[model samples]
Target chain A: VLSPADKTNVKAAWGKVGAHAGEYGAEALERMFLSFPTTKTYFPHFDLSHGSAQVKGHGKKVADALTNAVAHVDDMPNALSALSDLHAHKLRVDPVNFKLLSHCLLVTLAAHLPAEFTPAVHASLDKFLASVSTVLTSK
Target chain B: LTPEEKSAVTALWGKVNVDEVGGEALGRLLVVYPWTQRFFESFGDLSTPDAVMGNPKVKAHGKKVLGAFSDGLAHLDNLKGTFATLSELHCDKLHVDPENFRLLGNVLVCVLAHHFGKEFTPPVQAAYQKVVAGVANALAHKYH
Candidate 1:
């Protein structure tokens, strides 16, 4: 469970991050491809090349989902279950890909909000992502 | 809301059927809340107010969204199933924040105000506010 303070921090940080979610999201998608090239199997249509249109577009999608999850931090698991279902059952994405995505998200936050993305904030977000990944993989 | 106010607002809202005006609201939302633009990746360049307003797909989706609100308000007495379906699609599949619904309501109000102008009486405005708040409440309360 996130502490009250953690919850507040998460929400505040997300507000800033979400405002520029398009840029940060695009960066995270690029990072995901860089870190886990094997995950590319999911998107056969998009041009995942750096700075490509699809990369930016799909990247924004990833960021938006994360922002929504952060907004409802208390309901992260259930909030993300449907997304997890799509990845797990429908797309059949490997569970570990989510962990990779989390790593990229962390990187995105750290890069964008250096002053606000402190170790405590990272820990809070890490815990949240861990829970989300657990839920996504459960089924 | 009073029955007369409800009837008046319904009539005004039904005149537009929400698609055209709802698209306008979505356009404003995309500009005010850029993060929301990400959700419509396939819709193209939703960063500007005019981008989504001109997009066919976004307009259609916007209409459906507002139409659902209209349906919900008309059937407020039996909204359990509607809320359930909304909660599932929003929370589970779409992972949309409940706050965004509130944002949409705010923008929708602005758009309606622009259109209704002189006819946006207190009763009509209050009726819409009540319905928007009710829908937001229902969406937020659905945990699963």
Candidate 2:
């Protein structure tokens, strides 16, 4: 179980986000690419220009996956089962990138949802993302 | 890694003068991302690119870093175990930002592709990426 505190914090915060989840995901991916271009190596076939369409498309999927995990916080491994296999057997996404993108997502949320994101929110959000990543990056 | 990828990594590493390449790679890290110098204060006068480029201390540390990579290569099945002590050391001793591991890894890739030119073929580079990415992950475990 994600710490009870973290689960409540994330559940409440995500409850406020509706259609904007896709926007947050795209912004976070943009932040990640601009800040840590090294991550671009994993997506060589995709366009990486600033605010590129492909980044937007992938970002929406990323957010959709995270929203799915948020829905099944206690069963996170099952929530991301196929994606984890893709990461392990297909792309071999470095564990490092998981942390990198997680940071970007937190930054994106904190920037846009300042009223909603508190210190406790940041902590719980990071833990929740880490919780999701543990399953998605599972070997 | 497949048998072919494994063999490619072995052959490529055998050709690497890791000692010198390490120096070049780390040197470029400091230059390309100047903020990283904050981690190497004792290297003496990193205010200039030339100073950071060929400093003996940089070369020395670079050698150790690549040596660590060599160790990782030998223990691919056990990278977390291989780098446990180093992970703790980098965490507690210096309190390094884990992202720097990524910066240095990619910098080494640039150095390899630069020095090897066409010889650092796509397959060779791909093998190296997987290896370095694992090493970066291993080194970064303490941050979590």
Candidate 3:
């Protein structure tokens, strides 16, 4: 949890998104993920064989990776290296798959967010995802 | 993941917006695979607003945008599974290096505590945090 001060800050940070929410936002991207199921394999690596082993563990890694990356989105190069490290070194999950996953993430957000997931939110998420794609390929 | 776990995750779906979550998630994804420029183009500067808006035409043309990644409610189930898989993979890999993995987890907790509302439920937060830690450890082991 976010402390009261933290919430205020986040709410305020979100405020900066104003009209941009219409272009890209959270809900919109979630919808994209929903609409595009194929992308599921790339990001949603739920263990087929094992019970909850793989999904829970790696999911956290991916989540932390994301937190670190967004904490510094302005520094695109650094973000790219973070992405490259995953693709280049560890689990090499295919890039082609990420393509589909990105699409799905966008569609899913649009569908889920409904009201708050405005056009701007959709656009911004798109922009952010695009940046992510760049980081992946830059490796 | 178990059905009970599925319910737990699904219950929280309404609050788990992707863009908010994706900012961190996508950022992590990018950092993991930084060399694929063609792949990296997805995050590149957009030419038009439509492209950013996830317009189908724009998505198709812009960066191989296809469709949504998760189902509105259904995604919760999928996300549960995704995390489950990721956790297992990372745990196996991190047997040798637990400290760095824990540090990564610390960052995630801070981010989540910041991302989710202050009122965010403890059970939900704990569940998600566990998933994230597993993933970071896995990545660190895979690369470094």
DockQ per candidate = 0.01, 0.02, 0.03
Lowest lDDT sum, 10 consecutive residues, model 3 chain B, at: B28-37
DockQ for candidate 2? 0.02
Docking level of model 3? incorrect
Alpha-carbon runs more than 4 Å astray in model 3: A1-46, A49-53, B1-144
Name model 2 segments beyond 4 Å from true. B1-144
Model 2 vs truth, CA RMSD: 14.4
Which CAPRI quality tier does the interface of model 2 achieve?
incorrect
lDDT, candidate 3, at A25: 33
lDDT of 1 at B2: 65
> Number of the top candidate by TM-score?
2
- Model 1 - which docking category? incorrect
True contacts recovered per prediction: 0.00, 0.00, 0.00
DockQ of 1: 0.01
**What are the candidates' C-alpha RMSDs?**
19.5, 14.4, 17.1
TM-scores of all models?
A: 0.47, 0.51, 0.35
| Candidate 1 lDDT score at position A84 | 77
RMSD of 3: 17.1
| Tens digit of per-residue lDDT, candidate 2, span B83-130 | 888899988788888878876775665566545654655456566657
